[PDB]
Design a protein around this ligand. Structure first.
Ligand SMILES: Nc1ncnc2c1ncn2[C@@H]1O[C@H](CS)[C@@H](O)[C@H]1O
Ligand SMILES: Nc1ncnc2c1ncn2[C@@H]1O[C@H](CS)[C@@H](O)[C@H]1O
Lengths: 284, 287
């Protein structure tokens, strides 16, 4: 018999309901505090953090049907055992094409600050991801060139990419001038301005990074406009990378309709204990 | 293996309630309801009518993912060929357990926007339910229904419950409807007809052999109201009895919620004898 998971709009968090499309089977989970950056060691337990990471223990069951109503979102599912959760979660870790998405990230009222500690906070929450992406870009054929970060933040991420591919020109852009001030110490080039006004000519970058198309940063319409803005900077055959601390607001299906063929959709921690969103797309 | 497509319905002017899902062969298909060939298929062309009927031509593709946004709902899907739709639609016709539902029926503005019922208006409703009247009584016989007390919580003109009372003679037909103009017409068709909100059922608790609900649907009630009314109507059904959910407009209660409430679905959709059309027809056994 099926079960129902609910997130109300007034005080619930619809953006915490994630879907995992594994092996033609859709699973539903509720994101909680994840073990960050790695799993609990033998004698030292890992710290918890609300971040991009999902783990098997946050899975709920096998999605049968949803019902989006006036004041809440409901997902009907058949519950999964703890061992069944881990095995299906492992199959998603073994397949980076697995989509991890949050279909209700723009529902509810909850979705409706640059300091020295605030820059350190987001840099820490993106660590498990700075460790993953540059190596994974090498395995996907990235050879270097011009790397464009449309919302570079401190610039630590794009700098990590430029370290992995020596000779890559790192060009950052951020809306916050406090962000740009820091990013100029880590990047060859950092511009102050909204991503909707890109600072580089079109089709001039071999890698475009988008970390701002996400819940609590932009709305749905804006995220799709900024996606078309950042991707217009990518040359043909180049790579577009979408990820984020908070749920990405664009689907990989929309990217495919935009001519951005997904090469991978999610990534896992080296231990395999967690999954996160990591869309790597090839512009056609 | 097909690059996706997108079907959109806006809340302000679109019709999200017209997007239907077909859960056939362990996969979800998406379609948009248009005017169906009613009551039967076409060498004379049948009349077209917005009703409970969906046809294979109304399918769009295989659901990949949806995105319920602030001002619209989108469904990403791989489009199906016309021959492919009929093949999958025929497999749904051949399995009345196929769930046909409208998961966005309670979203949008159109579903948010008198004393007299004329003779022609009563004719209008009975005609829209004719395919449904021809099907359920014969289908309820094949599912073990032997008779007793048949309670219709929103009997409307009463013609539907009268059809049931004819397939199973000796059954006491109890009607109820919010509208007093409905009750007056249903009194001429049923053993008794009561005026009142189905949230206050006019029939003893846990005493009916069959409960019919045509009011748990879009444009009739809200979502929370539909669930409260379902609880009230099913509460009149005796253990082991049958509860039937159906509607001219999309049914607002999920089959999964019926199973959570002790109502085991024996079938979820029905098909015209021609097999050309499908419609929602939940038959639930109470435990
Ligand atoms: N529309 C936009 N264009 C460029 N950068 C943006 C942005 N919206 C947010 N950001 C930038 O993205 C970073 C992570 S939230 C943050 O440093 C913010 O300044
Ligand atoms: N809350 C309610 N209780 C009983 N009947 C209701 C109702 N809401 C609508 N109805 C009745 O159901 C029928 C739907 S086509 C219609 O004849 C209306 O009078």
């Amino acid at each position: 018999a099926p079960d129902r998971v609910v997130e109300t709009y007034a005080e619930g968090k619809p953006y915490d309901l994630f879907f995992l499309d594994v092996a033609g089977v859709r699973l539903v989970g509720r994101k909680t505090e994840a073990a960050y950056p790695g799993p609990d060691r033998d004698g030292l337990p890992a710290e918890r953090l609300k971040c991009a990471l999902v783990e098997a223990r946050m899975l709920l069951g096998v999605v049968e049907r949803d019902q989006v109503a006036e004041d809440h979102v409901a997902v009907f599912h058949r519950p999964l055992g703890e061992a069944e959760k881990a095995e299906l979660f492992a199959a998603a870790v073994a397949d980076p094409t697995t989509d991890l998405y949050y279909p209700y990230a723009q529902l509810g009222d909850r979705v409706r600050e640059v300091t020295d500690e605030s820059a350190r906070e987001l840099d820490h929450a993106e660590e498990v991801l700075r460790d993953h992406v540059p190596d994974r870009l090498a395995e996907l054929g990235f050879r270097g060139g011009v790397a464009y970060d449309a919302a570079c933040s401190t610039g630590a991420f794009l700098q990590a990419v430029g370290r992995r591919f020596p000779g890559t020109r790192t060009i950052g852009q951020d809306l916050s001038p406090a962000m740009v001030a820091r990013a100029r110490t880590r990047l060859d080039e950092a511009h102050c301005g909204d991503g909707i006004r890109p600072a580089i000519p079109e089709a001039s970058a071999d890698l475009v990074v988008c970390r701002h198309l996400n819940a609590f940063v932009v709305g749905t319409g804006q995220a799709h406009d900024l996606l078309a803005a950042a991707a217009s900077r990518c040359r043909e055959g180049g790579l577009v990378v979408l990820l984020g601390h908070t749920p990405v607001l664009v689907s990989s299906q929309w990217c495919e309709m935009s001519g951005l063929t997904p090469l991978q959709r999610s990534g896992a921690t080296p231990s395999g204990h967690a999954l996160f969103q990591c869309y790597v797309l090839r512009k056609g």
